[model samples]
Target chain A: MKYQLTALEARVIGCLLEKQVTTPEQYPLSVNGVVTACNQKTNREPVMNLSESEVQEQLDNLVKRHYLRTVSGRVTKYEQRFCNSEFGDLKLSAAEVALITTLLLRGAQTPGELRSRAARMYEFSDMAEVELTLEQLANREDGPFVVRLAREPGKRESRYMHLFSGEVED
Target chain B: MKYQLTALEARVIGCLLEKQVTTPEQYPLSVNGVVTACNQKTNREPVMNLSESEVQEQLDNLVKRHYLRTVSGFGNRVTKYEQRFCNSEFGDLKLSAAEVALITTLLLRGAQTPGELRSRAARMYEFSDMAEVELTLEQLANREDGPFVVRLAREPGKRESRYMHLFSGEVED
Candidate 1:
């Protein structure tokens, strides 16, 4: 059968959108910081220790699929673009879209607290996969694809508030 | 590895609800007739010829699993019931009640035609089992759980609208 994006990507995006990363700079969240909120199996490893190869691979795959894009942030530090990956055959799979849509249907999340599980009701996938996909989604134009309050790269948190037009948020 | 309803069962329900012949009439539906209309695999052989023994295996399995209920219709005819089944441990394995609830949210299926996809789309197993799950959901409750408008039983003359909602002429308005 044909393979597509797992639900993890959507869940992560949903988790990211709910947060208030008013400033990712002062807030610089560890990888786990943003992950724990989504309740996904995260890299227990510290954010700084994720290694370039792992981050690169996730970024590359997501970018190639159009799910993410690297961008520039304050102080010359680079952040993800995230505003362009909304629709189409880009990187997100039908399942991922469904999961994220479910989350949006549920609410927003902070960048630091986004967990794949809370974002997507179904397991979607395991921790590593969710992280990898999250990293990829982040690197996209709307780079990470999650809808945060601000466009800056500051660390944010997850939210259950219903920002989207849908009414299922709790 | 629990059991869930299959396309075969959904189609069976669609057929039963169509003709409203709780029992097999004088002429049993041709195997090809039942299988083909519901978009099922009809390798050869009439359905009646495979009763309570061959195809019955699937039917009995459905009954045992509680997805189908068999009753003796008029003249000692055997009729099939496709509702009684519930969502058991199999969860996502087959068409469970939860999946039905999910699909109904998409749209009342504007139309009630049955869902017929390739064996691969059947998604009875695997991590990505949603479309087939969608079909089962398409035919449940008012959509496929009774003898009213858009019934889900295996009956006659409903080859076109397998999952269509057919309510009674006097349903509560």
Candidate 2:
């Protein structure tokens, strides 16, 4: 994608994706709700302490980019158009959405780590299934959505990282 | 001071600040000039390969924010741009020559110690000693409006702490 998301924008979208499956009842989050999810102490790396206004600004920017849309209600609610066939340009499967969401929330992960972390979003049947999905994402016809990182010294498995943030340093 | 700059915005402004002092004859740079400086192979932390349109977009954004102002060159036919980041009537942020030099370095590069800043900023401004660089860095970190730079914790086995710009959000190692 030519567009690059700022760290705050990525965090906001990651929260939306996580909340959608983890809490279906709260699928479309209010600005306040998104603020809470973004700053929540758990499941976040480098936990943020953003004010409501900061979160709101990111939400507005995302809506303008059409990566997110607002649902008109008593209080406006926000939902992601980042992936899925029905939504944004990317026509990803549920498993793909789960993997990308995890990468957005966390930087990079091993296939093993992805299978475990993405479990709350989409259940992978086995390590073989996770590997197959990752390979498909890496070899997409449009462009590689993710790449297999060179294995770190003494590490058992190479990590896969998303390219939405631009190229990641080895 | 409440404004935040994207990485590209920071690079564009950083180039403007650098070229103004280093190449005064070409102080106000055209869009092409800025693009060349941004994609230059040296003195940049993450050397970029930005197209003219990409650099132009960043220039337009910075201009709208008033951190930059366009100048008409070639008798108003050619439009060149200059930075208003500091030492300009348009903004409250002001700095000494040394201070501007150090800030420019931090924006172009990621972070550096007073020693590294002293060496790197020499082309733009000369520091009498390491003490002067440290004092300038302290002033940037303690600005009343908002600290422009911050001193990161000294890393293990390192004698000097590194300072980074605050224009981008908090840095995470």
The candidate that achieves the highest TM-score relative to the unseen native structure: 2
Error of 1 at A24 (Å): 37
What tens digits encode model 2's per-residue C-alpha lDDT throughout B1-173? 67689999999999998876656445578888999999988889889999999998998888888999987634357678878787654367767767878989999988898999988887666666899999989998787878888898999999999999888877754
lDDT of 1 by residue, B87-136 (tens): 22222222332332322211122233333322222211222344544445
Across A1-170, the per-residue lDDT of candidate 1 in tens digits comes to 11233334333344343221212112222334334434533421111233434434544565565545444333221122232121233344323333344445234543333344333222333455444444554466632444334433554433332222322323
The CAPRI classification for model 2 reads as: incorrect
lDDT of 2 by residue, A29-128 (tens): 8999999999988778768999999999999999998889988767889978776412235767657777888888887889999997877666676898
Residue A78, candidate 1: Cα error in Å is 39
